[PDB]
């Protein structure tokens, strides 16, 4: 809505909010990111450190599918299966542990943030972290690798 804007309130004020001394001119200072090393250097250094220069090795023809490895933490591991899977295993008299295949749910790596409830579980994944495997074995579970 153009009726809610400052231009309706600036009718009758000669400078339109841009001043009488400095006026509103075309491009004082340059166009775009002009002069980022000369007369806008303070702004670029203050808010964008690291902007200028090269760092690291360049790699031609990056295929992002090769490095596709979504990760899931331990605190969300039991959300990949139904609540019925969880409650049946908890009240199970035998030592049967459900299998959570994180690859089926769309994750490849199991990271170890958080804590697990105290009941065994078999976790299928492409990759595990050291602490994720340690906590899974702590609750009596097992880590099994898939490809």
């Amino acid at each position: 809505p153009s009726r809610l804007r400052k231009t309706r309130k600036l009718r009758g004020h000669v400078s339109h909010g841009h001043g009488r001394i400095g006026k509103h001119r075309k491009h004082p200072g340059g166009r775009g990111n002009a002069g980022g090393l000369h007369h806008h250097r303070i702004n670029f250094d203050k808010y964008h450190p690291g902007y200028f220069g090269k760092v690291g090795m360049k790699h031609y023809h990056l295929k992002r599918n090769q490095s596709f490895c979504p990760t899931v933490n331990l605190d969300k591991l039991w959300t990949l299966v139904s609540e019925q899977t969880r409650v049946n295993a908890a009240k199970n008299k035998t030592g049967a542990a459900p299998i959570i295949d994180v690859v089926r749910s769309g994750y490849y790596k199991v990271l170890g943030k958080g804590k697990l409830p105290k009941q065994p579980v078999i976790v299928k994944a492409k990759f595990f972290s050291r602490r994720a495997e340690e906590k899974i074995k702590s609750v009596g579970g097992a880590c099994v690798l898939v490809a």
Partner: protein, 187 residues
Amino acid sequence: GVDIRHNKDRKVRRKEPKSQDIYLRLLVKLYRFLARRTNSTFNQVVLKRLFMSRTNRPPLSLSRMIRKMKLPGRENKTAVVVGTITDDVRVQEVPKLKVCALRVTSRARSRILRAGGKILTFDQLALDSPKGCGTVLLSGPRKGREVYRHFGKAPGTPHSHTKPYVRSKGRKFERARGRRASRGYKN
């Protein structure tokens, strides 16, 4: 003439909700009367939070609510939040909670009710405790927002750990000069 300054005369605060939600305005009418006609400071805090903007009323997760209600001496008390109660899927067991919230997520509401809990709106809370007795007034994390990572001292100053505004994150985006001693300086 009087030697005074007028630049701080007008106090800047919400005197009413900027929202046009008529259900929020009705229970603002309710708690405006309660704050005026009682001596309870609980009603005054609740009323001023009803005026507040959404960023000033962050959501409260189930885990944080459970943790604050598990502190000693808070049993059988009503957890009141002026805002949304949100499910947390990182908690496995939900105790019996009595809660009053402006909004409750569908899944958080189902979990609370299965645990044997109780959910009240703010008009039911007024009937249940007009003076707000036996309540635990909680708030969500106010600074749990992405904007607060960018706030603070400028990223290009020493000892500042504030996130810069970058379109993309990678080894080519704002990592060379001013970020490592090998390229000019680090600070």
